[PDB]
Structures are given as C-alpha cells and as structure tokens.
Design a protein around this ligand. Structure first.
Ligand SMILES: OC[C@H]1O[C@@H](O)[C@H](O)[C@@H](O)[C@@H]1O
Ligand SMILES: [Ca+2]
Length: 309
C-alpha cells in the first residue's frame, strides 16, 4: 500500500534544486503506491530540523534530505536513527564519517572536483582561441570568482579546481576579486556591480562563477556597465543558461545532471522504503553508499546536444 516518503529541499527558489525538485515529483507520478511529502526548508536548518520531526511523526518509510547545512547530517541521522528510517542525502554532501555512522544513510550527488576541472578546461580552451581576452597582454588570466556557499562541497571543489586545472595546463592566473554570492543571482549581480564600480574594474578579463545562477547575475551586471565583451563561465547548464550560451552571453557551463540525480534519489528512497536494498532493480552504481552522476562540459561547440531536442 501507500508508502510515505518525506523530502526536504533546502530552499525551493534555488534554481538548480527547483529542477531537481520537479524531476523527483515527476518520477513519483509513476509510482502509484508512493505518497511524497515535500517540504521547503526555506534555507534554515532549524526549520528543516522541525520538518523532519513532523515527517517522522507522520510515519514516513524513508527520508530524502537536501540539507541546508551539510554539517547538520549528524543531527538528521540521530533523528532518523530513532525510528530506524533510511535517509538518502542528496546534493549537499555530508562528511564520510557522518555517512559511516548509520547503516541506512546514503548520498546521491556528484564528484564535485570534476566540475571544477571541466570548467578549467573550458576556460583554457576558450582563452587559447581568444587571445583578445588577455587585455593587458601579460599572458595571465586576471579573473574574479563568484563562490557558492562557504563549506559547501561543490563551492569548495569548484573554486579550488578551476584554478588548479588552468595552472596545471600551464596558464598563470591572477585573482583580482573572490567573494561568495551564496549561489544566488541577485547577490552575484550586486557583487559584480561593486567590482565593476571599483579600482580593478578595468583589469578584469574573465568571470568565473561556481554556478549558472551566479553567472547570470554577473551577465546582468556586465550588461549594465556595457562590459558584455567580458566572458563568463558557470556550472549547471540550466535551460536559462543554455540560451545565454547560444547567445554568446555565457562562454561555457557544465551540465549538473538534475534528471539522473533526481531519478537515483527517488529509486534509492523507494527501494529503501520498501525494505529492498538500495539499487535493487536499477542500474545505479553504489560505491560505499554513494551514487555520483557525471558532469559534462557544455559550450557552443557541443550545445546542439543539450539544447532543445
Ligand atoms: O546545493 C545547491 C547548489 O548545488 C550545486 O550543485 C549547484 O550547482 C548549485 O546551482 C546549487 O545552488
Ligand atoms: Ca592578462
């Protein structure tokens, strides 16, 4: 009969998680026996903590949790432990030690560093093809970087590896500005705006963003200052972003596969809810209770395979 699965999204207006949320709900439409209890945590772990308590009180058979704070996985795990309910963490990765503390805790996401490395290769590729981008002709990339949430695995890996990758490829970089915009378009637009209104405004050659939402706020700020000739790189390949790649407003992005992360999250939760063993009847490859879905770089050269088809 009706299996109840509780789901928490850290914040429903996060652009990426909005795609993932809708894919989980679509996926559930095809499981007649499952009932999903979806909750918006409104970007507050305290709110999310209360929500989990309510779900557990309502008898859910499994939890699929998108943590507000990755550091709170131990807290959620003790709550789930109390009812011996399985928990599938997704998109914000908990510590390995957290994961190991409970037999029924699983994680569905990505190899974060890989997105950093792919983005670094895309920049390296476009920089080599656009020697016009080296505004001060010093052979170095004068960049600014819009960071996601500090402490978020994706934000820390993307920030470290985009630069390491460029440097490894023999391209010297000079960090002009680095600040977090917490994955949000409006905050990124305000940060970029301040940067274009200060002393290095003219030294900036490339804008690197940890995600497409932040990259879109940078694009708007560049447009506002008639600096649309400065390239912007993001991560996610949101449909809104693909349009900017087509336009030339975005130089490149990286597909964060929401459809397969949604499907893996739903399959595992359902299987666990059913007392079945996480990958039963699926082709998902679990490696020490983790499922990682690959990233794919996207630019004008391969757009036609991501874009509208
Ligand atoms: O946790 C939410 C964040 O996840 C990252 O994987 C996504 O690339 C960001 O767009 C999103 O804001
Ligand atoms: Ca330069």
């Amino acid at each position: 009969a009706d299996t109840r699965i509780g789901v928490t999204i850290y914040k429903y207006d996060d652009n990426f998680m909005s795609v993932v949320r809708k894919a989980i709900e679509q996926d559930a439409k095809a499981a007649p026996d499952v009932q999903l209890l979806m909750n918006d945590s409104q970007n507050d772990q305290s709110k999310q903590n209360d929500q989990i308590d309510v779900l557990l009180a309502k008898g859910v058979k499994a939890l699929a949790i998108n943590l507000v704070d990755p550091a709170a996985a131990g807290t959620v795990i003790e709550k789930a432990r109390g009812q011996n309910v399985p928990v599938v963490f997704f998109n914000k990765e908990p510590s390995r030690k957290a994961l190991d503390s409970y037999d029924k805790a699983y994680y569905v996401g990505t190899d974060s560093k890989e997105s950093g490395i792919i983005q670094g290769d895309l920049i390296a590729k476009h920089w080599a093809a656009n020697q016009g981008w080296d505004l001060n002709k010093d052979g170095q990339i004068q960049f600014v970087l819009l960071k996601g949430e500090p402490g978020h695995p994706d934000a820390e890996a993307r920030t470290t590896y985009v630069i390491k990758e460029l440097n490894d490829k023999g391209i010297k970089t000079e960090q002009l500005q680095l600040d977090t915009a917490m994955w949000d378009t409006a905050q990124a637009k305000d940060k970029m705006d301040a940067w274009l209104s200060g002393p290095n405004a003219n030294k900036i050659e490339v804008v690197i963003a940890n995600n497409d939402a932040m990259a879109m706020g940078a694009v708007e700020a560049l447009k506002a200052h008639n600096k649309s000739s400065i390239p912007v790189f993001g991560v996610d390949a949101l449909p809104e972003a693909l349009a900017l790649v087509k336009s030339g407003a975005l130089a490149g992005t990286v597909l964060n596969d929401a459809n397969n992360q949604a499907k893996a999250t739903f399959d595992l939760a359902k299987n666990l809810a059913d007392g079945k063993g996480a990958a039963d009847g699926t082709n998902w490859k679990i490696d020490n209770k983790v499922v990682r879905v690959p990233y794919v770089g996207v630019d004008k050269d391969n757009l036609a395979e991501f874009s509208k088809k």
